[PDB]
């Protein structure tokens, strides 16, 4: 076949994360540079008074749209005079910041190369002289708009290597490689329109357009060729005030179905990890603009709707196909489908699509005990399912279950224990209220040495060869008032 080992899988996931973080920090720092005062005082002189007035039109009461109009004309004229300002555009030396293949990353370490350093001063000098690749160009442009006191964001489409691509050989088509790579930009600009209350998209260098993105954006790469070096999944916005917002939603038509699959956020851990990175780069308080943009994203989420294809509904965050409901799940009472899918390939063939919020997860009595829950009195099971030598296991909903409260320890601290002489503690709930769990390889030896009243704690089950399960006795449940005594014994175990 053509799938690498699992070790490589994990290495690619880690390298993907690391690379993403580095790219996002690069965007942050470059946004700092863009704010340079020494630069803005120079670029300010590029914008005639007439244009400044167009960028800051009078608020129009009767019809705010006319003001938007004047704003857009100013942005257009700014774009025009930026072409006059730059003149020399350089090619990207090596794929610029477009996506690299795993093979390329592997072989980059193989051969070292001289790198001409770019310091803050070099950046400023290049922007003022109008010399450089398209990225430095757009960056200068954002700097100019900021020099003219317009709320202009730098937008970066971060292109880390694709951790979903599990191929060993990851070769690319050489035909029109560069032209296809540069067909869409990595950096562009967003400008806040206070009159219509929306971010306006501005690419003055590559596509040389201004658009007011509703559902479709001219800047999202299209075509298999182009998406091999430009996979849109992390569109990051940096603002005047050192803000950092994930803005992919504006530029990705299928954020929830397609893009999500290609993002580190596709699972809970990556979600938290990315939120941590953003927060670490988000150096400002929330504004009303954020509120407006969040409403925009919420509407875009509302109107993305059900995806057109079966694959895009695998692991969707909001919807599930009828046929993908697990044997251990039920439709919540009174709910039905929330939509349908025309199945591409079969005339009139259609699949029922359910919202995930309407699917309930069921577990058996044992499974609930493993989550520290028992069944309520007169609870009726919602489903019956087979198992192995077979067996009819009943399944119950969370509402049919109750929190298990274990009996308290006696005055002397004696715990009540199961038939094997152990206490089963699979959930914090399962510790007696007046007791504590001490997890330690020697907590048993300690409690035995003190001769105090305790109970070994079965915290989980080790599955092992042969055919046989084994309990994992990871420690002790003692009364609370004996904790430090145990902890003292544990600490001095070498002296017993």
């Amino acid at each position: 076949r053509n799938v690498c080992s699992n070790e490589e899988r994990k290495r690619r996931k880690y390298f993907h994360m690391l690379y993403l973080v580095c790219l996002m920090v690069h965007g942050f720092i470059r946004n700092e540079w863009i704010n340079s005062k020494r630069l803005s005082r120079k670029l300010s002189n590029l914008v005639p008074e007439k244009v400044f007035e167009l960028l800051h039109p009078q608020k129009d009461e009767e019809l705010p749209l006319r003001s938007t109009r004047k704003l857009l004309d100013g942005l257009k004229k700014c774009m025009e005079l930026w072409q006059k300002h730059w003149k020399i555009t350089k090619k990207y030396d090596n794929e610029g910041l477009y996506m690299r293949t795993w093979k390329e990353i592997e072989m980059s370490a193989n051969n070292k190369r001289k790198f001409k350093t770019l310091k803050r001063s070099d950046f400023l000098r290049a922007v003022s002289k109008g010399h450089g690749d398209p990225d430095i160009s757009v960056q200068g442009f954002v700097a100019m708009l900021r020099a003219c006191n317009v709320n202009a964001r730098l937008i970066m489409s971060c292109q880390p290597p694709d951790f979903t691509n599990m191929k060993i050989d990851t070769s690319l088509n050489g035909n029109n490689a560069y032209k296809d790579m540069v067909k869409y930009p990595i950096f562009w600009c967003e400008v806040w329109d206070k009159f219509s209350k929306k971010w306006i998209t501005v690419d003055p260098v590559n596509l040389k357009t201004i658009e007011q993105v509703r559902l479709h954006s001219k800047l999202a790469p299209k075509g298999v060729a182009c998406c091999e070096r430009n996979m849109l999944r992390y569109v990051i916005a940096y603002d005047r005030k050192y803000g950092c917002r994930d803005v992919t939603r504006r530029y990705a038509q299928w954020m929830n179905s397609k893009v999500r699959k290609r993002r580190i956020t596709k699972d809970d851990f990556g979600e938290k990890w990315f939120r941590k990175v953003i927060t670490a780069l988000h150096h400002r308080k929330r504004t009303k603009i954020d509120d407006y943009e969040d409403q925009y994203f919420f509407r875009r989420d509302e109107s993305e709707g059900i995806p057109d294809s079966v694959q895009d509904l695998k692991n969707h965050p909001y919807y599930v196909l009828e046929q993908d409901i697990k044997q251990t799940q039920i439709v919540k009472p009174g709910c039905k489908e929330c939509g349908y899918l025309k199945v591409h390939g079969k005339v009139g063939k259609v699949l029922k699509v359910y919202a995930k919020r309407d699917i309930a997860d069921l577990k058996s009595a044992r499974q609930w005990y493993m989550n520290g829950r028992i069944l309520k009195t007169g609870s009726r099971c919602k489903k019956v399912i087979k198992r192995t030598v077979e067996e009819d296991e009943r399944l119950y909903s969370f509402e049919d279950t109750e929190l298990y409260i274990p009996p308290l320890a006696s005055a002397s601290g004696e715990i009540t224990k199961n038939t094997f002489g152990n206490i089963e503690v699979f959930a914090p709930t399962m510790i007696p209220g007046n007791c504590c769990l001490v997890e330690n390889p020697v907590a048993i030896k300690a409690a035995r040495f003190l001769g105090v009243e305790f109970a070994p704690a079965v915290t989980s089950f080790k599955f092992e060869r042969g055919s046989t399960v084994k309990p994992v006795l990871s420690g002790i449940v003692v009364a609370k008032w004996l904790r430090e005594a145990i902890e003292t014994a544990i600490d001095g175990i070498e002296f017993i």
Binding site: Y14, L18, V21, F28, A109, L118, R120
Partner: protein, 53 residues
């Protein structure tokens, strides 16, 4: 728990030469097995490291 030299190189590449990320990260991650667990659990610390000086 990295050296001064490597944090310097990393900041310089990140700030002004990110086209050179690929080989540097190849070297650093090959020389710092621990980094993996740091990034996974404490990415903000790494960020702020880069954000200093």
């Amino acid at each position: 728990g990295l050296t001064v030299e490597d944090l310097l190189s990393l900041r310089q590449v990140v700030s002004g030469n990110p086209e050179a990320l690929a080989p540097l990260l190849e070297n650093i991650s090959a020389r710092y097995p621990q980094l993996r667990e740091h990034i996974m659990a404490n990415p903000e610390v790494f960020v702020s490291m880069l954000l200093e000086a």
